[PDB]
């Protein structure tokens, strides 16, 4: 059964793409370089500002390729998938407000999809150290609020605009599971990180923190958790992104506490999945238009259990 | 006679450059700083993560300058040059598998050059310590296997993919001289270390880098290989360290080691050169640019 983004959602997608996700990053250049060994004159307070600013595909510049339309749109698919899975779980995760994702309605998922469109829209570079991250999330929140108060007051109440603005903002001190709305926004973003993060971050965790895939299996069970993993990898391929290989025989040899590795192996199981190279055509099709991206996403089958 | 990189070697060079060597390092930033007074505060388990991440030249960031395209391509010149010298030696070094460099063919040197292009491709920072080294070599070995099984099966057999993958992986416990393939890979990487290591490591020593060359290839060929390397450093824009043996007694190394080094290498004085940003960029930002720079350096008369 397909995961559908309706005309209202796609209308907002067009707005976000036009006003934000298609735009060049602006906190870039020599004025934004950083040096850890020796302070220097700069605007930056950490690294990352000049990474992955744009790629060129058939002579056309795709700005912000790692946080652009495809990344954004993929996350809207994940939330709908996890909403289905949570509703099947004997004890879904209770968030700080006493509510679970299974407490959400279909209308709530529409509102969450709309907010997810803005989640990384405020970025002005790839920088991801705290100060930059927080500023960029505040900027995206303000972009959401401005649009919502002009165009979405028939759909969002005032309390809802405040809740979703805050979910986007991700203020210092906020909890990852504050509300189910915020939780699913964060989890969706986490899933998409598999495309760029190491085996350590995806499967093992650092010291505290669990790997991405083990989180999914903790929440959704092994079957649905691995199925959400595979689904996302499918969307990566459909949208032209390199699909990392997965090889659990490599895990004991990455420098991680073996206690930690063996825990990962017992949760995930032995796993071996081939990688795939990036496809520039598919990257441009998914990056340069809402309809192009959405067609790519819709090409990928959902898990058999999705309804 | 020139050292030639074949068209297929260059094809693989382009791929490794686009996919890996051009790309920014990832095990960088505030989560990878290290303070030994507080060893587990971040993800780092040692020093170096945030060292020489990139250099900006004429407005363009040249990522991983220490372990980039020019470092990698220079190593392929060295292996071809050591293969020629090995064939002149009366008793080339027998590796753990019973074979020597002189046992290799020209086709094995091509395969060796292709594996050499992945040798540091898996690095994700300048981190110096074992855990990071070994993870980075495992990553490069798997980047080579993935590429080779998709694109190189017309050239490499499955046994060869396994061999060269293991050469790049450099697993804890592996022998430096396990096979002539891996030996020559390791020797070529060490040659390139001359550009960044102290005269202690280069001359005095374990055996110093230059005395190792002289033990294996004779003093004439060994010093010629050292000089050729230093030529490729200059052609690619790298700073060329001075050599002054008159300083060797003043470095805090014991005298007996200094004497040994002078007995093997001889007195030696060679001036340094400063880095050249334009040549660094030319050699760092494209395969063709790098290969042109490497070709400009005359090879030893005996090559």
Coordinates of C-alpha atoms in Angstrom, one line a residue:
Chain A
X1 CA 0.0 0.0 0.0
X2 CA 1.5 3.4 -0.9
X3 CA 2.3 6.2 1.6
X4 CA 0.5 9.2 0.2
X5 CA 1.4 12.9 0.4
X6 CA -1.7 14.8 -0.5
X7 CA -2.2 18.0 -2.4
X8 CA -2.0 20.1 0.7
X9 CA 1.3 18.6 1.8
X10 CA 2.8 18.9 -1.7
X11 CA 1.7 22.6 -1.9
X12 CA 3.7 23.4 1.2
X13 CA 6.6 21.3 -0.2
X14 CA 6.6 23.6 -3.3
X15 CA 6.8 26.7 -1.0
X16 CA 9.6 25.3 1.0
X17 CA 11.5 24.2 -2.0
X18 CA 11.1 27.6 -3.8
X19 CA 11.9 29.8 -0.8
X20 CA 14.5 27.8 1.1
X21 CA 15.7 24.4 -0.2
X22 CA 16.6 25.5 -3.6
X23 CA 18.5 28.5 -2.3
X24 CA 22.3 28.7 -1.9
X25 CA 23.8 28.5 1.6
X26 CA 24.9 31.9 2.8
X27 CA 27.2 31.2 5.8
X28 CA 30.0 30.3 3.5
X29 CA 33.4 31.6 2.4
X30 CA 36.7 32.5 3.9
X31 CA 34.9 34.5 6.5
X32 CA 33.4 31.3 7.9
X33 CA 36.5 29.0 8.2
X34 CA 37.6 27.7 11.5
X35 CA 40.8 26.5 13.1
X36 CA 40.9 24.4 16.3
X37 CA 44.7 24.8 17.0
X38 CA 44.9 28.7 16.8
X39 CA 42.0 31.1 17.1
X40 CA 41.6 33.4 14.1
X41 CA 39.4 36.1 12.8
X42 CA 36.2 34.4 11.5
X43 CA 32.4 34.4 12.0
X44 CA 32.4 30.7 12.6
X45 CA 32.3 29.1 16.0
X46 CA 33.1 25.6 14.7
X47 CA 33.6 23.6 11.5
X48 CA 31.6 22.6 8.5
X49 CA 30.6 25.9 6.9
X50 CA 32.2 25.3 3.5
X51 CA 31.4 21.6 3.1
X52 CA 29.1 20.2 0.4
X53 CA 27.7 23.6 -0.6
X54 CA 26.5 22.4 -4.0
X55 CA 27.1 19.8 -6.7
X56 CA 26.9 20.2 -10.4
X57 CA 24.8 17.7 -12.4
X58 CA 24.8 18.1 -16.2
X59 CA 26.0 21.8 -15.7
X60 CA 23.1 22.6 -13.3
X61 CA 24.1 23.5 -9.6
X62 CA 22.2 21.6 -7.0
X63 CA 22.5 23.6 -3.8
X64 CA 22.6 22.0 -0.3
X65 CA 22.6 18.5 -1.7
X66 CA 22.9 16.8 1.7
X67 CA 20.0 18.9 3.3
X68 CA 17.8 19.6 0.2
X69 CA 14.5 18.5 -1.2
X70 CA 15.2 14.8 -1.3
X71 CA 16.4 14.5 2.2
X72 CA 13.4 16.5 3.4
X73 CA 10.9 14.6 1.5
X74 CA 12.2 11.2 2.5
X75 CA 11.6 12.1 6.1
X76 CA 7.8 12.6 5.5
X77 CA 7.7 9.0 4.2
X78 CA 9.4 7.6 7.3
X79 CA 6.9 9.3 9.8
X80 CA 4.0 7.8 8.1
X81 CA 5.7 4.4 8.2
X82 CA 6.6 4.6 11.8
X83 CA 3.0 5.8 12.7
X84 CA 1.8 2.4 11.3
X85 CA 4.4 0.4 13.1
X86 CA 3.8 2.1 16.5
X87 CA 0.0 1.3 16.3
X88 CA 1.0 -2.5 16.1
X89 CA 3.3 -2.5 19.1
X90 CA 2.1 -3.9 22.4
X91 CA 3.7 -1.0 24.4
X92 CA 4.6 2.1 22.3
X93 CA 7.0 4.6 23.6
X94 CA 5.6 7.0 26.1
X95 CA 6.8 10.5 25.5
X96 CA 7.5 13.2 28.2
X97 CA 3.9 14.5 27.7
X98 CA 2.4 11.0 28.5
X99 CA 1.4 10.4 24.8
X100 CA 2.7 7.9 22.3
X101 CA 2.9 7.9 18.5
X102 CA 0.0 5.5 18.4
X103 CA -2.1 8.3 20.1
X104 CA -1.7 10.4 16.9
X105 CA -4.4 10.7 14.3
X106 CA -4.1 10.7 10.6
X107 CA -4.6 14.5 10.6
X108 CA -1.8 14.8 13.2
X109 CA 0.5 13.0 10.7
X110 CA -0.5 15.6 8.0
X111 CA 0.5 18.4 10.4
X112 CA 3.7 16.6 11.3
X113 CA 4.5 16.1 7.6
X114 CA 4.0 19.8 7.0
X115 CA 6.3 20.7 9.9
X116 CA 8.9 18.2 8.7
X117 CA 9.2 20.2 5.5
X118 CA 10.7 23.1 7.4
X119 CA 13.0 21.0 9.8
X120 CA 16.2 21.7 8.0
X121 CA 15.0 24.6 5.8
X122 CA 16.6 27.2 8.0
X123 CA 20.1 25.9 7.4
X124 CA 22.6 28.4 6.0
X125 CA 25.5 25.9 5.7
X126 CA 26.4 22.3 6.6
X127 CA 27.8 23.5 9.9
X128 CA 26.4 21.3 12.7
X129 CA 28.2 22.3 15.8
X130 CA 25.8 23.4 18.5
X131 CA 25.7 27.1 17.9
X132 CA 25.1 26.8 14.2
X133 CA 22.7 23.9 14.5
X134 CA 20.5 25.8 17.0
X135 CA 20.5 29.0 15.0
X136 CA 19.5 27.1 11.9
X137 CA 16.7 25.3 13.7
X138 CA 15.4 28.6 15.1
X139 CA 15.5 30.0 11.6
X140 CA 13.5 27.1 10.2
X141 CA 11.0 27.4 13.0
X142 CA 10.5 31.1 12.2
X143 CA 10.1 30.2 8.5
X144 CA 7.4 27.6 9.5
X145 CA 5.6 30.1 11.8
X146 CA 5.5 32.8 9.2
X147 CA 4.1 30.6 6.6
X148 CA 1.6 28.9 8.9
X149 CA 0.2 32.1 10.3
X150 CA -0.4 33.4 6.7
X151 CA -1.6 30.2 5.0
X152 CA -2.4 27.4 7.4
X153 CA -4.6 28.9 10.1
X154 CA -7.5 26.8 8.9
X155 CA -5.5 23.6 9.5
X156 CA -3.2 24.6 12.5
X157 CA -4.6 26.1 15.8
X158 CA -2.5 28.6 17.7
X159 CA -1.4 25.9 20.2
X160 CA -0.4 23.7 17.2
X161 CA 1.7 26.4 15.6
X162 CA 3.5 26.8 18.9
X163 CA 4.0 23.0 19.3
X164 CA 5.3 22.5 15.8
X165 CA 7.5 25.6 15.8
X166 CA 9.1 24.3 19.0
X167 CA 9.6 20.8 17.5
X168 CA 11.5 22.5 14.6
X169 CA 13.4 24.8 16.9
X170 CA 14.9 22.0 19.0
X171 CA 16.0 24.4 21.7
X172 CA 19.0 23.7 24.0
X173 CA 17.6 21.6 26.7
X174 CA 14.7 20.1 24.8
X175 CA 14.1 16.4 25.1
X176 CA 14.2 14.1 22.1
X177 CA 10.9 12.5 23.1
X178 CA 9.1 15.6 24.5
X179 CA 5.9 14.8 22.5
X180 CA 5.1 12.2 20.0
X181 CA 5.1 14.8 17.3
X182 CA 8.6 15.9 18.1
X183 CA 9.7 12.4 18.6
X184 CA 8.6 11.2 15.2
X185 CA 10.2 14.3 13.6
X186 CA 13.5 13.4 15.3
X187 CA 13.3 9.7 14.5
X188 CA 12.6 10.4 10.8
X189 CA 15.6 12.7 10.6
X190 CA 17.7 10.0 12.4
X191 CA 16.7 7.4 9.8
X192 CA 17.9 9.5 6.9
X193 CA 21.4 9.9 8.5
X194 CA 22.1 6.3 7.5
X195 CA 23.0 7.5 4.1
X196 CA 26.1 9.5 5.4
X197 CA 27.0 8.1 8.8
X198 CA 29.5 5.4 9.7
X199 CA 28.9 1.8 10.8
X200 CA 29.6 2.8 14.3
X201 CA 26.9 5.5 14.4
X202 CA 24.4 3.3 12.5
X203 CA 24.8 0.0 14.3
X204 CA 27.0 0.3 17.4
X205 CA 26.6 3.6 19.1
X206 CA 29.4 5.5 20.9
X207 CA 29.6 5.6 24.8
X208 CA 24.9 6.3 26.8
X209 CA 23.8 6.3 23.1
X210 CA 22.5 3.5 20.9
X211 CA 23.0 2.9 17.3
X212 CA 20.4 4.1 14.8
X213 CA 19.2 0.6 13.7
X214 CA 19.2 -0.7 17.2
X215 CA 16.9 2.2 18.2
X216 CA 14.5 1.2 15.4
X217 CA 14.5 -2.4 16.6
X218 CA 14.0 -1.4 20.2
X219 CA 10.9 0.6 19.2
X220 CA 9.4 -1.4 16.5
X221 CA 10.7 -4.9 16.9
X222 CA 13.4 -6.6 14.8
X223 CA 11.1 -7.3 11.9
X224 CA 9.6 -3.9 11.4
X225 CA 12.8 -2.1 12.5
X226 CA 14.9 -3.8 9.8
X227 CA 12.1 -3.3 7.3
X228 CA 12.1 0.5 8.0
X229 CA 15.9 0.4 7.5
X230 CA 15.5 -1.4 4.2
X231 CA 12.8 0.9 3.1
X232 CA 14.9 4.0 3.7
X233 CA 17.8 2.4 1.7
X234 CA 15.3 1.9 -1.1
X235 CA 14.4 5.5 -1.0
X236 CA 18.1 6.4 -1.0
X237 CA 18.6 4.4 -4.2
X238 CA 15.4 5.8 -5.8
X239 CA 16.7 9.3 -5.2
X240 CA 20.2 8.6 -6.5
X241 CA 22.0 8.6 -3.2
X242 CA 24.9 6.2 -2.6
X243 CA 23.6 3.3 -0.5
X244 CA 26.3 2.2 2.0
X245 CA 27.2 -1.4 2.2
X246 CA 26.4 -3.2 5.5
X247 CA 28.7 -5.9 6.8
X248 CA 28.5 -7.0 10.3
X249 CA 31.7 -9.1 10.0
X250 CA 33.5 -5.7 10.0
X251 CA 32.0 -4.5 13.3
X252 CA 34.4 -6.2 15.7
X253 CA 37.2 -4.4 14.0
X254 CA 36.2 -0.8 14.3
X255 CA 37.6 0.1 17.7
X256 CA 34.4 -0.3 19.7
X257 CA 34.2 -2.0 23.1
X258 CA 33.3 -5.6 22.3
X259 CA 30.7 -5.7 24.9
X260 CA 29.0 -3.0 22.7
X261 CA 29.5 -4.9 19.4
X262 CA 28.1 -8.1 20.8
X263 CA 25.0 -6.3 22.1
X264 CA 24.6 -4.9 18.6
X265 CA 25.0 -8.3 17.0
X266 CA 22.4 -9.8 19.4
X267 CA 19.9 -7.0 18.6
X268 CA 20.4 -6.7 14.9
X269 CA 21.7 -10.2 14.0
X270 CA 24.4 -11.0 11.5
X271 CA 23.8 -8.8 8.5
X272 CA 25.3 -8.3 5.1
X273 CA 23.8 -6.1 2.5
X274 CA 25.5 -4.8 -0.7
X275 CA 26.1 -1.0 -1.4
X276 CA 25.2 0.9 -4.4
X277 CA 26.9 3.8 -6.2
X278 CA 25.3 7.2 -6.4
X279 CA 23.3 8.0 -9.6
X280 CA 23.6 11.6 -10.8
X281 CA 20.5 11.5 -12.9
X282 CA 18.3 10.2 -10.2
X283 CA 20.0 12.8 -7.7
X284 CA 19.0 15.6 -10.0
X285 CA 15.4 14.3 -10.7
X286 CA 14.7 14.1 -6.9
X287 CA 16.6 17.4 -6.1
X288 CA 15.1 19.8 -8.5
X289 CA 11.4 19.4 -8.3
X290 CA 8.7 18.3 -5.8
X291 CA 6.9 16.2 -8.5
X292 CA 10.1 14.5 -9.6
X293 CA 11.1 13.7 -6.0
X294 CA 7.7 12.4 -5.1
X295 CA 7.5 10.2 -8.1
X296 CA 10.8 8.7 -7.1
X297 CA 9.7 8.1 -3.6
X298 CA 6.4 6.6 -4.7
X299 CA 8.3 4.0 -6.9
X300 CA 9.6 2.2 -3.9
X301 CA 7.4 -0.5 -2.4
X302 CA 6.4 -0.2 1.2
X303 CA 6.8 -2.9 3.8
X304 CA 4.1 -5.7 3.4
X305 CA 2.8 -4.7 6.8
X306 CA 2.1 -1.1 5.9
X307 CA -1.5 0.0 6.0
Chain B
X1 CA 62.8 6.1 -19.4
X2 CA 59.5 7.3 -17.9
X3 CA 57.5 5.5 -15.3
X4 CA 54.1 5.1 -17.0
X5 CA 50.7 4.9 -15.3
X6 CA 48.5 2.8 -17.6
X7 CA 45.1 4.1 -18.8
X8 CA 43.3 1.6 -16.6
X9 CA 45.3 2.7 -13.5
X10 CA 44.3 6.3 -14.3
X11 CA 40.7 5.3 -14.7
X12 CA 40.7 3.8 -11.2
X13 CA 42.6 7.0 -10.0
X14 CA 39.7 9.1 -11.2
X15 CA 37.2 7.0 -9.3
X16 CA 39.1 7.0 -6.1
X17 CA 39.7 10.8 -6.4
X18 CA 36.0 11.5 -7.0
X19 CA 34.6 9.2 -4.4
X20 CA 37.2 9.4 -1.6
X21 CA 40.3 11.5 -1.9
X22 CA 38.5 14.7 -2.9
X23 CA 36.0 14.3 0.0
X24 CA 36.2 15.9 3.3
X25 CA 37.3 14.0 6.4
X26 CA 34.4 13.1 8.7
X27 CA 35.9 12.1 12.0
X28 CA 36.5 15.9 12.7
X29 CA 35.0 18.7 14.8
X30 CA 34.3 19.2 18.4
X31 CA 33.3 15.6 19.0
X32 CA 36.7 14.5 17.9
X33 CA 38.9 16.8 20.0
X34 CA 41.2 15.1 22.5
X35 CA 42.5 16.0 26.0
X36 CA 44.5 13.1 27.6
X37 CA 43.6 14.4 31.1
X38 CA 40.1 13.4 30.1
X39 CA 40.5 10.5 27.6
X40 CA 36.8 9.7 27.1
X41 CA 35.2 13.1 27.0
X42 CA 34.5 12.9 23.2
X43 CA 34.5 10.3 20.5
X44 CA 38.3 10.6 19.9
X45 CA 40.7 8.1 21.5
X46 CA 43.8 10.1 20.7
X47 CA 45.3 13.1 19.0
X48 CA 45.2 14.3 15.4
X49 CA 41.5 14.3 14.3
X50 CA 41.5 18.0 13.7
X51 CA 44.9 18.4 12.3
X52 CA 45.5 19.4 8.6
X53 CA 41.8 18.8 7.6
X54 CA 42.2 20.9 4.6
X55 CA 44.2 23.8 3.1
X56 CA 42.6 26.6 1.1
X57 CA 44.4 27.6 -2.0
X58 CA 43.2 30.5 -4.2
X59 CA 39.8 30.1 -2.6
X60 CA 39.3 26.4 -3.0
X61 CA 39.5 23.9 -0.1
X62 CA 41.9 21.1 -0.8
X63 CA 40.7 18.4 1.5
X64 CA 43.1 15.8 3.3
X65 CA 46.3 17.5 1.9
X66 CA 48.6 15.1 3.7
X67 CA 46.7 12.0 2.5
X68 CA 45.3 13.1 -0.8
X69 CA 45.7 12.5 -4.5
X70 CA 49.4 13.6 -4.7
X71 CA 50.5 11.4 -1.8
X72 CA 48.6 8.5 -3.2
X73 CA 49.9 8.9 -6.8
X74 CA 53.5 9.4 -5.8
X75 CA 53.4 5.9 -4.1
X76 CA 52.5 4.3 -7.4
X77 CA 55.8 5.7 -8.9
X78 CA 57.8 4.3 -6.1
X79 CA 56.6 0.7 -6.4
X80 CA 57.4 0.6 -10.2
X81 CA 60.9 2.0 -9.4
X82 CA 61.6 -0.5 -6.6
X83 CA 60.4 -3.4 -8.8
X84 CA 63.1 -2.4 -11.4
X85 CA 65.8 -2.2 -8.7
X86 CA 64.8 -5.5 -7.0
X87 CA 65.6 -7.3 -10.3
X88 CA 69.2 -6.3 -10.0
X89 CA 69.8 -7.6 -6.5
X90 CA 71.6 -10.9 -6.0
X91 CA 69.3 -12.0 -3.0
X92 CA 66.0 -10.0 -3.0
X93 CA 64.1 -10.2 0.2
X94 CA 62.1 -13.4 0.6
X95 CA 58.6 -12.6 2.0
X96 CA 56.6 -14.8 4.3
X97 CA 55.0 -16.5 1.4
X98 CA 58.3 -17.5 -0.1
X99 CA 58.2 -15.0 -2.9
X100 CA 60.2 -11.8 -3.7
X101 CA 59.6 -8.5 -5.5
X102 CA 61.7 -9.9 -8.3
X103 CA 59.1 -12.7 -8.6
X104 CA 56.4 -10.1 -9.6
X105 CA 55.4 -9.4 -13.2
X106 CA 54.6 -6.1 -14.9
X107 CA 51.0 -7.1 -14.8
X108 CA 51.3 -7.6 -11.0
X109 CA 52.8 -4.1 -10.7
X110 CA 49.6 -2.7 -12.5
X111 CA 47.4 -4.5 -10.0
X112 CA 49.6 -3.3 -7.1
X113 CA 49.3 0.3 -8.4
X114 CA 45.5 0.0 -8.5
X115 CA 45.5 -1.3 -4.9
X116 CA 47.8 1.5 -3.9
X117 CA 45.3 4.0 -5.0
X118 CA 43.0 2.8 -2.1
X119 CA 45.7 2.5 0.5
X120 CA 44.7 5.7 2.4
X121 CA 41.4 6.2 0.8
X122 CA 39.5 5.0 3.9
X123 CA 41.0 7.7 6.2
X124 CA 38.5 9.9 7.9
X125 CA 41.0 12.2 9.6
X126 CA 44.7 12.8 10.4
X127 CA 44.3 10.7 13.6
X128 CA 47.6 9.0 14.3
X129 CA 46.8 6.3 16.8
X130 CA 46.3 2.6 16.2
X131 CA 42.6 2.3 16.6
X132 CA 42.0 5.0 14.1
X133 CA 44.7 3.7 11.7
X134 CA 43.3 0.2 11.6
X135 CA 39.7 1.4 11.2
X136 CA 40.7 3.6 8.3
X137 CA 42.6 0.8 6.6
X138 CA 39.6 -1.6 7.0
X139 CA 37.5 1.1 5.5
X140 CA 39.8 1.5 2.4
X141 CA 40.1 -2.3 2.0
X142 CA 36.3 -2.5 1.8
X143 CA 36.1 0.5 -0.6
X144 CA 38.6 -1.4 -2.8
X145 CA 36.6 -4.7 -2.6
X146 CA 33.3 -3.1 -3.5
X147 CA 34.8 -1.2 -6.4
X148 CA 36.9 -4.2 -7.7
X149 CA 34.0 -6.7 -7.6
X150 CA 31.8 -4.3 -9.7
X151 CA 34.4 -2.7 -12.0
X152 CA 37.6 -4.8 -12.1
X153 CA 36.7 -8.4 -12.6
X154 CA 38.2 -8.3 -16.1
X155 CA 41.5 -7.7 -14.5
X156 CA 41.5 -9.1 -11.0
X157 CA 40.6 -12.6 -10.0
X158 CA 38.7 -13.3 -6.8
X159 CA 41.9 -14.5 -5.1
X160 CA 43.6 -11.3 -6.2
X161 CA 40.8 -9.1 -4.9
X162 CA 41.2 -10.9 -1.5
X163 CA 45.0 -10.5 -1.5
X164 CA 45.0 -6.7 -2.4
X165 CA 42.1 -6.0 0.0
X166 CA 44.2 -7.6 2.8
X167 CA 47.2 -5.6 1.7
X168 CA 45.2 -2.4 2.2
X169 CA 43.5 -3.6 5.4
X170 CA 46.9 -4.0 7.3
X171 CA 45.1 -6.0 10.0
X172 CA 46.6 -6.1 13.5
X173 CA 49.0 -9.0 13.5
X174 CA 49.8 -8.9 9.8
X175 CA 53.4 -9.1 8.7
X176 CA 55.1 -6.2 7.0
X177 CA 56.6 -8.6 4.5
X178 CA 53.8 -11.1 4.3
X179 CA 53.8 -11.1 0.4
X180 CA 55.9 -9.1 -2.1
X181 CA 52.7 -7.2 -3.1
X182 CA 52.1 -6.1 0.4
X183 CA 55.8 -5.4 1.1
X184 CA 56.1 -3.1 -1.8
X185 CA 52.9 -1.3 -0.9
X186 CA 54.3 -0.7 2.6
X187 CA 57.7 0.3 1.3
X188 CA 56.2 2.8 -1.1
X189 CA 54.1 4.4 1.7
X190 CA 57.2 4.7 3.8
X191 CA 59.2 6.4 1.2
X192 CA 56.6 9.1 1.0
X193 CA 56.9 9.7 4.8
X194 CA 60.2 11.4 4.2
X195 CA 58.4 14.6 3.5
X196 CA 57.0 14.9 7.0
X197 CA 59.2 12.9 9.4
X198 CA 62.3 13.9 11.4
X199 CA 65.8 13.0 10.4
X200 CA 65.7 10.7 13.3
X201 CA 63.1 8.5 11.6
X202 CA 64.4 9.0 8.1
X203 CA 68.1 8.3 8.7
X204 CA 68.9 7.2 12.3
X205 CA 66.1 4.8 13.1
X206 CA 63.8 -0.1 13.8
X207 CA 65.7 0.8 10.8
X208 CA 65.5 4.4 9.3
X209 CA 63.7 4.8 6.0
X210 CA 66.8 5.6 3.9
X211 CA 68.9 2.9 5.5
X212 CA 66.2 0.4 4.7
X213 CA 66.3 1.4 1.0
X214 CA 70.1 1.1 1.0
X215 CA 69.9 -2.4 2.7
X216 CA 67.4 -3.6 0.0
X217 CA 68.6 -1.9 -3.1
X218 CA 72.2 -0.9 -2.5
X219 CA 73.5 2.5 -1.6
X220 CA 73.4 3.9 -5.2
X221 CA 69.9 2.8 -6.0
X222 CA 68.6 3.5 -2.5
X223 CA 69.9 7.1 -2.5
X224 CA 68.6 7.5 -6.1
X225 CA 65.1 6.4 -4.9
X226 CA 65.4 9.0 -2.1
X227 CA 66.3 11.7 -4.5
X228 CA 63.6 10.8 -7.0
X229 CA 61.0 11.0 -4.1
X230 CA 62.3 14.4 -3.2
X231 CA 61.9 15.4 -6.8
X232 CA 58.3 14.3 -6.8
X233 CA 57.7 16.2 -3.5
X234 CA 58.9 19.4 -5.3
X235 CA 57.0 18.8 -8.5
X236 CA 53.8 18.3 -6.5
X237 CA 54.3 21.5 -4.4
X238 CA 55.3 19.9 -1.2
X239 CA 57.9 21.4 1.2
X240 CA 61.2 19.4 0.7
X241 CA 63.1 19.0 4.0
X242 CA 66.7 19.8 4.1
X243 CA 69.2 17.1 4.9
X244 CA 72.4 18.0 6.9
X245 CA 74.2 15.2 8.5
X246 CA 76.4 17.6 10.4
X247 CA 73.3 18.1 12.6
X248 CA 72.8 14.3 13.3
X249 CA 75.1 14.3 16.4
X250 CA 73.0 17.2 17.9
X251 CA 69.6 15.6 17.9
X252 CA 69.7 13.7 21.2
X253 CA 70.2 10.3 19.7
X254 CA 73.0 8.2 21.0
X255 CA 76.3 8.3 19.2
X256 CA 76.5 4.7 18.2
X257 CA 73.2 5.2 16.2
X258 CA 74.6 8.3 14.5
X259 CA 77.7 6.4 13.6
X260 CA 75.8 3.5 12.1
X261 CA 73.7 5.9 10.0
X262 CA 76.8 7.7 8.7
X263 CA 78.4 4.4 7.9
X264 CA 75.4 3.3 5.8
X265 CA 74.3 6.6 4.2
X266 CA 77.4 8.6 4.2
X267 CA 77.8 12.3 4.8
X268 CA 74.9 14.1 3.2
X269 CA 73.9 17.7 2.5
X270 CA 70.8 18.6 0.4
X271 CA 69.0 21.8 0.6
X272 CA 65.3 22.2 1.4
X273 CA 62.6 23.8 -0.6
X274 CA 59.5 25.7 0.6
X275 CA 56.0 24.5 -0.4
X276 CA 54.4 26.0 -3.6
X277 CA 50.7 26.5 -3.3
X278 CA 50.0 26.6 -7.1
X279 CA 51.8 23.2 -7.7
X280 CA 50.0 21.8 -4.6
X281 CA 46.7 22.6 -6.1
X282 CA 47.5 21.4 -9.5
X283 CA 48.6 18.1 -8.2
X284 CA 45.8 17.8 -5.7
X285 CA 42.7 18.7 -7.7
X286 CA 42.9 16.3 -10.7
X287 CA 44.4 13.1 -11.8
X288 CA 45.7 14.6 -15.0
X289 CA 47.3 17.5 -13.2
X290 CA 49.0 15.2 -10.7
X291 CA 50.2 12.8 -13.4
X292 CA 51.7 15.6 -15.4
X293 CA 53.6 16.9 -12.4
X294 CA 54.9 13.3 -11.6
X295 CA 56.0 12.8 -15.3
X296 CA 58.0 16.0 -15.2
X297 CA 60.5 14.4 -12.8
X298 CA 63.3 12.5 -14.5
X299 CA 63.6 8.9 -13.4
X300 CA 67.0 7.4 -12.2
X301 CA 69.3 6.6 -15.1
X302 CA 69.0 2.9 -14.3
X303 CA 65.2 2.7 -14.5

